Design an enzyme around this catalytic site. Structure first.
Site, PDB file in Angstrom:
ATOM      1  N   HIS A  48       0.810  -1.230   0.000  1.00 53.81           N
ATOM      2  CA  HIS A  48       0.000   0.000   0.000  1.00 53.81           C
ATOM      3  C   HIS A  48       0.848   1.287   0.000  1.00 53.81           C
ATOM      4  O   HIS A  48       0.388   2.340  -0.454  1.00 53.81           O
ATOM      5  CB  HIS A  48      -1.050   0.008   1.140  1.00 53.81           C
ATOM      6  CG  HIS A  48      -0.497   0.291   2.516  1.00 53.81           C
ATOM      7  ND1 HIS A  48      -0.372  -0.707   3.459  1.00 53.81           N
ATOM      8  CD2 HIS A  48      -0.106   1.465   3.074  1.00 53.81           C
ATOM      9  CE1 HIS A  48       0.122  -0.126   4.543  1.00 53.81           C
ATOM     10  NE2 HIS A  48       0.296   1.179   4.360  1.00 53.81           N
ATOM     11  N   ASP A  97      -0.928  -7.491   1.123  1.00 55.39           N
ATOM     12  CA  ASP A  97      -0.221  -6.219   1.318  1.00 55.39           C
ATOM     13  C   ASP A  97       1.260  -6.445   1.625  1.00 55.39           C
ATOM     14  O   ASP A  97       1.670  -6.383   2.784  1.00 55.39           O
ATOM     15  CB  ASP A  97      -0.884  -5.413   2.444  1.00 55.39           C
ATOM     16  CG  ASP A  97      -0.468  -3.952   2.523  1.00 55.39           C
ATOM     17  OD1 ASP A  97       0.272  -3.491   1.623  1.00 55.39           O
ATOM     18  OD2 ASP A  97      -0.893  -3.265   3.484  1.00 55.39           O
ATOM     19  N   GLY A 188       1.523   6.165   9.787  1.00 56.60           N
ATOM     20  CA  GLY A 188       2.953   6.413   9.668  1.00 56.60           C
ATOM     21  C   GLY A 188       3.821   5.221  10.000  1.00 56.60           C
ATOM     22  O   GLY A 188       5.024   5.264   9.752  1.00 56.60           O
ATOM     23  N   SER A 190       3.244   2.239   8.615  1.00 57.83           N
ATOM     24  CA  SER A 190       3.081   1.417   7.438  1.00 57.83           C
ATOM     25  C   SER A 190       4.360   0.751   6.957  1.00 57.83           C
ATOM     26  O   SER A 190       5.395   1.424   6.785  1.00 57.83           O
ATOM     27  CB  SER A 190       2.512   2.249   6.300  1.00 57.83           C
ATOM     28  OG  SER A 190       1.159   2.573   6.562  1.00 57.83           O
TER      29      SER A 190
HETATM   30  O1  LIG Z   1      -2.535   3.815   8.173  1.00 55.99           O
HETATM   31  C1  LIG Z   1      -2.430   2.765   7.559  1.00 55.99           C
HETATM   32  N1  LIG Z   1      -1.588   1.752   7.958  1.00 55.99           N
HETATM   33  C2  LIG Z   1      -0.795   1.909   9.162  1.00 55.99           C
HETATM   34  C3  LIG Z   1      -1.581   1.482  10.330  1.00 55.99           C
HETATM   35  C4  LIG Z   1      -1.532   0.289  11.023  1.00 55.99           C
HETATM   36  C5  LIG Z   1      -2.450   0.238  12.109  1.00 55.99           C
HETATM   37  C6  LIG Z   1      -3.183   1.397  12.235  1.00 55.99           C
HETATM   38  S1  LIG Z   1      -2.768   2.535  11.009  1.00 55.99           S
HETATM   39  C7  LIG Z   1      -3.249   2.442   6.323  1.00 55.99           C
HETATM   40  C8  LIG Z   1      -2.548   2.979   5.081  1.00 55.99           C
HETATM   41  N2  LIG Z   1      -2.607   4.450   5.058  1.00 55.99           N
HETATM   42  C9  LIG Z   1      -1.500   5.153   4.702  1.00 55.99           C
HETATM   43  N3  LIG Z   1      -1.314   6.455   4.661  1.00 55.99           N
HETATM   44  C10 LIG Z   1      -0.022   6.600   4.238  1.00 55.99           C
HETATM   45  C11 LIG Z   1       0.725   7.742   4.026  1.00 55.99           C
HETATM   46  C12 LIG Z   1       2.021   7.558   3.592  1.00 55.99           C
HETATM   47 CL1  LIG Z   1       3.007   8.974   3.331  1.00 55.99          CL
HETATM   48  C13 LIG Z   1       2.542   6.298   3.393  1.00 55.99           C
HETATM   49  C14 LIG Z   1       1.829   5.141   3.611  1.00 55.99           C
HETATM   50  C15 LIG Z   1       0.541   5.364   4.031  1.00 55.99           C
HETATM   51  O2  LIG Z   1      -0.408   4.433   4.318  1.00 55.99           O
HETATM   52  C16 LIG Z   1      -3.852   5.172   5.348  1.00 55.99           C
HETATM   53  C17 LIG Z   1      -4.980   4.220   5.690  1.00 55.99           C
HETATM   54  N4  LIG Z   1      -4.561   3.061   6.505  1.00 55.99           N
HETATM   55  C18 LIG Z   1      -5.406   2.444   7.417  1.00 55.99           C
HETATM   56  O3  LIG Z   1      -5.040   1.597   8.221  1.00 55.99           O
HETATM   57  C19 LIG Z   1      -6.844   2.898   7.439  1.00 55.99           C
HETATM   58  C20 LIG Z   1      -7.720   1.704   7.130  1.00 55.99           C
HETATM   59  C21 LIG Z   1      -7.513   1.144   5.725  1.00 55.99           C
HETATM   60  C22 LIG Z   1      -8.185  -0.226   5.610  1.00 55.99           C
HETATM   61  C23 LIG Z   1      -8.154  -0.821   4.213  1.00 55.99           C
HETATM   62  C24 LIG Z   1      -8.651   0.164   3.163  1.00 55.99           C
HETATM   63  C25 LIG Z   1      -7.956   1.517   3.250  1.00 55.99           C
HETATM   64  C26 LIG Z   1      -8.053   2.102   4.658  1.00 55.99           C
HETATM   65  N5  LIG Z   1      -7.169   3.369   8.830  1.00 55.99           N
HETATM   66  C27 LIG Z   1      -6.155   4.284   9.461  1.00 55.99           C
HETATM   67  C28 LIG Z   1      -6.370   4.322  10.961  1.00 55.99           C
HETATM   68  C29 LIG Z   1      -5.357   5.233  11.634  1.00 55.99           C
HETATM   69  C30 LIG Z   1      -5.422   6.645  11.090  1.00 55.99           C
HETATM   70  C31 LIG Z   1      -5.279   6.639   9.572  1.00 55.99           C
HETATM   71  C32 LIG Z   1      -6.263   5.693   8.897  1.00 55.99           C
END
Ligand SMILES: O=C(NCc1cccs1)[C@@H]1CN(c2nc3cc(Cl)ccc3o2)CCN1C(=O)[C@@H](CC1CCCCC1)NC1CCCCC1
Length: 241
Positions: A48, A97, A188, A190
């Site tokens: 992702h 993923d 952050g 990820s």
């Molecule tokens: O934040 C993420 N992964 C790290 C985490 C691990 C555990 C909690 S957060 C992922 C990826 N993301 C992401 N943003 C990024 C920005 C950058 Cl710069 C790089 C990688 C990134 O990955 C934004 C959405 N997201 C999410 O997890 C979304 C849910 C997904 C579920 C599947 C469909 C898409 C949405 N919720 C978070 C909950 C915490 C607050 C944010 C939203």
């Protein structure tokens, strides 16, 4: 040790240089991701992170970092030769993923140079999550120092209960953390690691998960969801030749 050697996120503590010597920091534009060095020329991260497909030439990998914002003499800055997302990655469900980054070798054919601060993590077949992400949901900034928190594995039956994640937990995913909340991965984090000390192999660090997604950060009944590294073992071995 050959791999998993060790020198010395919501609800975590600072993890100093050498605590997670395999952790890689990935930079491009105004974006950031974490990953894990699984071999001198290879880094395992989340797919992702790279879904918008940046050019491999725009990416920078830093090994040996403690603080995400400090230039450091023993830290290793490497270019990315190429990368491969899992062919089945779904941007809708986040199933499959995972991604491999092939680091750019120098004239002699070397990529990461091993030292007490830079070491590959073991592949699978007492757990912690690490990263530079938000220290709480809604934080205006990434953590300055690397953070580490202890989290236990949660069974598939408990993580897929309707009040937890229900039908969103798919083959290839695993959960770790607490149903009480407080300690978890966050925005952050990820692509970063979920490592366990392997009691059967001298407590060596073994990559069990890749930080993938969650509903909030440290919420009750909402533990972090990770990519199950063991589930994808043959894929990783096939694409790292
Ligand atoms: O934040 C993420 N992964 C790290 C985490 C691990 C555990 C909690 S957060 C992922 C990826 N993301 C992401 N943003 C990024 C920005 C950058 Cl710069 C790089 C990688 C990134 O990955 C934004 C959405 N997201 C999410 O997890 C979304 C849910 C997904 C579920 C599947 C469909 C898409 C949405 N919720 C978070 C909950 C915490 C607050 C944010 C939203």
């Amino acid at each position: 040790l050959s791999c998993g050697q060790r020198l010395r996120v919501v609800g975590g503590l600072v993890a100093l240089r050498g605590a997670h010597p395999y952790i890689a920091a990935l930079y491009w534009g105004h974006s950031f991701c974490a990953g894990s060095l699984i071999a001198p020329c290879w880094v395992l991260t989340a797919a992702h992170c790279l879904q918008d497909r940046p050019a491999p030439e725009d990416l920078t990998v830093v090994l040996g970092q403690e603080r995400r914002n400090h230039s450091c003499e023993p830290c290793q800055t490497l270019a990315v030769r190429s990368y491969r997302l899992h062919e089945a990655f779904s941007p809708v469900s986040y199933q499959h993923d995972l991604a491999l980054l092939r680091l750019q070798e120098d004239a002699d054919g070397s990529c990461a140079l091993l030292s007490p601060y830079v070491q590959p993590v073991c592949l699978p077949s007492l757990c912690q999550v690490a990263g530079w992400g938000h220290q709480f949901e809604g934080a205006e900034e990434y953590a300055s120092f690397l953070q580490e928190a202890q989290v236990p594995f949660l069974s598939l039956e408990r993580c897929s209960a309707p009040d937890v994640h229900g039908s969103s937990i798919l083959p290839g995913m695993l959960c770790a953390g607490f149903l009480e909340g407080g300690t978890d991965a966050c925005q952050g984090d990820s692509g970063g690691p979920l490592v366990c000390e392997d009691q059967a192999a001298e407590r060596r660090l073994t990559l069990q998960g890749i930080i993938s997604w969650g509903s909030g950060c440290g919420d009750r009944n909402k533990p972090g969801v990770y990519t199950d590294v063991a589930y994808y073992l043959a894929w990783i071995r096939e694409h790292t030749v």
